[PDB]
From a paper:
We therefore opted to use the same strategy for TodX and CymD, and reasoned that a lack of growth on MAH after closing the lateral opening would provide strong evidence for a lateral diffusion mechanism. The lateral opening in TodX involves both β-strand S2 and S3, contrasting with EcFadL in which only strand S3 is involved. Strand S2 in TodX bulges outward, whereas S3 has a less pronounced kink in the same place as EcFadL. To flatten the S2 bulge, we removed seven residues that were not visible in the density of TodX, replaced a proline with alanine and inserted an alanine to connect the strands (ΔS2). We determined the X-ray crystal structures of both TodX variants which showed that, as expected, the size of the lateral opening is drastically reduced as a result of the flattening of the strands, while the remainder of the mutant structures are very similar to those of wild type. The two TodX mutant channels ΔS2 and ΔS2S3 have much smaller lateral openings, while retaining overall high structural similarity to the wild-type protein. Plate growth assays with vapour-phase toluene showed background growth for the TodX and CymD lateral opening mutants, indicating that they are defective in toluene uptake. For TodX, background growth is already observed for the ΔS2 mutant, so the effect of the additional flattening of strand S3 in the ΔS2S3 variant cannot be assessed.
Thus far, only the FadL OM channel family has been shown to mediate transport of hydrophobics. PpF1 has three FadL orthologs, of which TodX (Pput_2883) and CymD (Pput_2901) are located in the adjacent tod and cym/cmt operons respectively. Here we show, by using an integrated approach combining growth assays, X-ray crystallography and molecular dynamics (MD) simulations, that MAH uptake as the first step in biodegradation does occur via lateral diffusion. In the presence of TodX/CymD, robust growth is observed, providing the first direct evidence for MAH transport by FadL-type channels.
Author numbering: 4 to 400, 408 to 428
The structure:
């Protein structure tokens, strides 16, 4: 979602972030970094663009071709008040997700009828940090940040009867409606969710949250820095909106019901990263961070409740223990006095599998490989660059094979106010 450091610049160097100037994006990173910022007041201005490519194939020529793009932004201004550095920003990750069309084997009944229903998802995060960085000694900086959050989810899932069957079997599905139209669907049917309503005026199924953050740094040597930060599991609230469940019979008939979803305990990971920035040269600077996503850490259940005039349906997915580890290294050579060149590789590696291959919910990529530079044309104006690579992956276990990749591409601009 954003466990990739973030920063037009912190993206260029493998996602590294913990101990070196990473731009104003250190507000959602390590706010202690903001103390390595030029004097006066930096004003960052970022524009993100991701595209994503998913191929799903199984039981012969299953042909699910998704290929969306998303687009984010960055409006930030970190201001220096002596040893204090105050700052705030707006950050966007809008359009992220999937779209398969209503032509897919994903849009065929469990018995195999081509439905007109769509398979697609799209999320919109809206972080808004208020942060500070505090210079303390000639060797140690500290920073915190707190952010209001706002998420918006539209999605068009379809579940071939047997999946629903498995969900009732597990004890995860329930509700008035399950008995009632079990026979209308019938083994060989399918139910289909559609929370659309992107008109936020409607319901949209959206929520407000609160993230947190704080970190530090140590100049162990004069040519070596020592970063650490703990992102808090962001307390997202309930996603309440308006959706439309639609059961589908063996021969292709459709009952459209209209109600309200309430998604509960969408667990976001707390994370703790550590690393360093050795500088054995006045061009060659190199960063290396390890990150540990404190993932599954509460013993709740994500609870999706659909309530209609005709009764409720309800799904409860437990919070399995889980966690990931992103080893990220990055590099920035100074070709000249106006030019830095960055590159980075990073390898995430999660444990305990959790291989619930959800086509409409893409999975985090392990190997990333990123490049990028910087260029000055004003010295009080400045402009950063990055591109990263989601490296080819296979994941598969109903039987389903999926193979997908991602490709981020950022820009930002800092007009400095001395």
């Amino acid at each position: 979602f954003d466990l990739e450091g973030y920063g037009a610049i912190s993206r260029a160097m493998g996602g590294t972030s913990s101990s070196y100037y990473t731009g104003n994006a250190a507000l959602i990173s390590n706010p202690a970094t903001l103390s390595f910022a030029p004097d006066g007041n930096q004003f960052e201005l970022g524009l993100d663009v991701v595209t994503t490519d998913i191929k799903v194939h199984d039981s012969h020529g299953a042909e699910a071709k998704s290929s969306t793009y998303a687009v984010g932004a960055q409006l930030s201004y970190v201001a220096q008040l002596d040893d204090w550095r105050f700052g705030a920003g707006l950050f966007v990750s809008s359009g992220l997700g999937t779209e398969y069309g209503s032509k897919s084997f994903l849009s065929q009944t469990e018995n195999g009828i081509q439905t007109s229903f769509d398979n697609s998802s799209r999320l919109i995060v809206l972080r808004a940090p208020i942060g500070f960085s505090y210079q303390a000694t000639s060797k140690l900086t500290f920073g915190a940040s707190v952010d209001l959050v706002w998420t918006s989810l539209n999605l068009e899932l379809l579940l071939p009867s047997s999946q629903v069957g498995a969900l009732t079997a597990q004890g995860n599905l329930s509700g008035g409606l399950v008995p009632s139209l079990a026979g209308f669907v019938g083994t060989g049917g399918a139910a289909h969710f559609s929370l659309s309503r992107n008109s936020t005026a409607g319901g949209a199924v959206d929520a407000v949250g609160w993230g947190g953050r704080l970190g530090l740094t140590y100049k162990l040597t004069d040519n070596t820095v020592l970063g650490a930060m703990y992102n808090f599991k962001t307390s997202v609230g309930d996603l309440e909106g308006k959706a439309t469940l639609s059961a589908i019979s063996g021969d292709g008939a459709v009952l459209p019901l209209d109600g309200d979803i309430r998604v509960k305990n969408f667990e976001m990971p707390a994370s703790l990263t550590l690393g360093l920035a050795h500088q054995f040269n006045e061009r060659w600077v190199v960063a290396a961070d390890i990150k540990r996503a404190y993932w599954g850490d509460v013993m709740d259940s994500m609870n999706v409740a659909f309530i209609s005039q005709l009764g409720g349906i309800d799904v409860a997915l437990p919070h399995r223990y889980q966690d990931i580890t992103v080893a990220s290294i990055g590099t920035a050579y100074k070709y000249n006095n106006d030019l830095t060149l960055r590159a980075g590789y990073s390898y995430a590696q999660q444990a305990l599998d959790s291989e619930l291959i959800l086509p409409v919910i893409p999975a985090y990529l392990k190997r990333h490989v990123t490049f990028g530079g910087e260029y000055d044309f004003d010295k009080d104006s400045r402009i950063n660059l990055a591109i990263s690579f989601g490296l080819r992956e296979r994941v598969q276990t109903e039987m389903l094979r999926q193979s997908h990749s991602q490709i981020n591409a950022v820009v930002s601009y800092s007009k400095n106010f001395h």
